[PDB]
Amino acid sequence: IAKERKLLQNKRLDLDAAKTRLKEFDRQAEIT
Amino acid sequence: IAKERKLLQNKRLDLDAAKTRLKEFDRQAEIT
Secondary structure, eight states: OHHHHHHHHHHHHHHHHHHHSOOOOHHHHHHO | OHHHHHHHHHHHHHHHHHHHSOOOOHHHHHHO
């Protein structure tokens, strides 16, 4: 549980980096 | 022309970084 929520909080900022630059979190958030 | 193609070759790798991590280049490539 701590591993899945740690990778959730790790790759949440990775998808923040993927979505905020305009012009591993779905499955990880689902398992978490 | 050299400035627009330099920013093309600069931000092409930026959108490579944006698209290869799965789960400024459109307008720059159009002007170039």
